[PDB]
């Protein structure tokens, strides 16, 4: 008979001012006008302009939620530990900010870690905070403009940063990360998780659902090997999900 199923439906959502959308396709037509890098009008530009004045401090990268740091880092460490045949040579910290993840996790697990961050005062502070540590290159670029060499990384970290990518560029970037992995490499993707999206009109970003992410992974040609919610996460915050992708 008629029955609930345990598909490519439109994903609706809204922004933080309360404008609503029937689909993501409708939203990107609204949000991706003009020069994307215009600081006042541009999807990307507005986000970069927002970050220009964020303090280069842990409080700054954690949106004033400093106290979630320890649990976040322990969850990632336990998750990465569990990945079968994960390599331990080279890592890349994408949207690195001041190098928090590199400083507290990657430098303990990888022989060399590179950093990718488009905001100059964030990247500069990372250089200072990471002085005398197993760090390689400091790449001043956005994810969507970065060129990564093939067959290089055993881990590619994308945490609290893919919210700034358009879906088109999310798809492109994850496929580009895939070719940058070694055979024992994984993308480590850690992000806030909504089945509707929320455009944040303050920092020009969006939070997507698990189904939305997976739609994008499928389009990228990238597969989920492992996934898990961050345990012991404050109940009032968006859930934080980790994905290991190959
Ligand atoms: N398009 C983009 N590509 C790469 N990084 C970006 C982009 N837009 C914003 N960012 C950066 O993303 C960072 C988000 Se704050 C999170 C920082 C770090 N991943 C951590 O968890 O500690 C900021 O440093 C900001 O400058």
For the chain, the three-class secondary structure string (H helix, E strand, C coil) is CCCCCCCCCCCCEEECCCCEECCHHHHHHHHCCCCCCCCCCCHHHHHHHHHHCCCCCHHHHCCCCHHHHHHHHHHHHHHHHCCCCCCCCEEEEECCCCCHHHHHHHHHHCCEEEEECCCHHHHHHHHHHCCCCCEEEEECCCHHHCCCCCCCEEEEEEECCHHHCCHHHHHHHHHHHHHHEEEEEEEEEEEEECCCEEEECCCCEEEECHHHHHHHHHHHCCCEEEEEECCCCCCCCCCEEEEEEC
Instruction: Establish whether 159 is an annotated binding residue.
Output: yes
On whether residue 55 sits in a domain, the answer given is yes
Q: How far, in Å, from the CA of 96 to the mean position of ligand 1?
A: 6
On whether residue 69 sits in a domain, the answer given is yes
Q: Distance between CA 122 and CA 99 in Å, rounded?
A: 8
Ligand 1 and 99: CB distance under 6 A:
no
Contact 93, 157 (CB under 8 A): yes
CA angle 115, 233, 205 (to 5 degrees): 50
On whether residue 16 sits in a domain, the answer given is no
On whether residue 14 sits in a domain, the answer given is no
On whether residue 159 sits in a domain, the answer given is yes
Angle 167-180/210-220 helices, nearest 10 degrees? Answer: 60
Q: Distance between CA 48 and CA 164 in Å, rounded?
A: 9
Name the residue at shortest CA distance from atom 8 of ligand 1: 164
Our mutation pick for probing the ligand 1 site, out of 161, 174, 188, 202, counting the most ligand atoms within 8 A of Cβ, is 161
On whether residue 173 sits in a domain, the answer given is yes
Contact 15, 199 (CB under 8 A): yes
CATH of the domain at 72: 3.40.50.150
How many domains does the structure of the chain reveal? 1
**Domain enclosing residue 76, as ranges:** 28-241
Name the residue at shortest CA distance from atom 6 of ligand 1: 95
Contact 203, 50 (CB under 8 A): yes
Q: How far, in Å, from the CA of 217 to the mean position of ligand 1?
A: 20
Best CA proximity match to 130, nearest among 146, 113, 118, 116? 113
Ligand 1 and 60: CB distance under 6 A:
no
On whether residue 22 sits in a domain, the answer given is no
Rg of the chain over Cα atoms, rounded to whole angstroms, equals 18
Structural method: X-ray
On whether residue 214 sits in a domain, the answer given is yes
Please name the residue that has the structure tokens 């940063």. 161
Best CA proximity match to 179, nearest among 205, 204, 147, 206? 147
């Amino acid at each position: 008979g008629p029955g609930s199923m345990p598909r490519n439906l439109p994903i609706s959502g809204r922004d933080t001012n309360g404008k609503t959308y029937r689909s993501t396709d409708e939203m990107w037509k609204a949000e991706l006008t003009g020069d994307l890098y215009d600081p006042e009008k541009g999807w990307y530009g507005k986000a970069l302009e927002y970050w220009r004045t964020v303090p280069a401090t842990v409080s700054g990268v954690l949106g004033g939620m400093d106290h979630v740091h320890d649990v976040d880092i322990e969850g990632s460490r336990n998750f990465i530990a569990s990945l079968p045949g994960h390599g331990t040579s080279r890592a890349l910290d994408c949207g690195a900010g001041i190098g928090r993840i590199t400083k507290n996790l990657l430098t303990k697990l990888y022989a060399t870690t590179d950093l990718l961050e488009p905001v100059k005062h964030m990247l500069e502070e990372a250089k200072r905070e990471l002085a005398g540590m197993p760090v390689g290159k400091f790449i001043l670029a956005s994810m969507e403009t970065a060129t990564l060499p093939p067959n290089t990384y055993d881990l590619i970290v994308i945490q609290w940063t893919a919210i700034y990518l358009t879906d088109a560029d999310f798809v492109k970037f994850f496929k580009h990360c895939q070719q940058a992995l070694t055979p024992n490499g994984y993308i480590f993707f850690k992000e806030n998780c909504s089945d509707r999206f929320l455009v944040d009109k303050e920092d020009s970003s969006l939070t997507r659902s698990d189904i939305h992410y997976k739609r994008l992974f499928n389009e990228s040609g990238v597969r989920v090997v492992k996934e898990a919610f961050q345990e012991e996460w404050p109940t009032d915050l968006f859930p934080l999900k980790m994905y290991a992708l190959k």
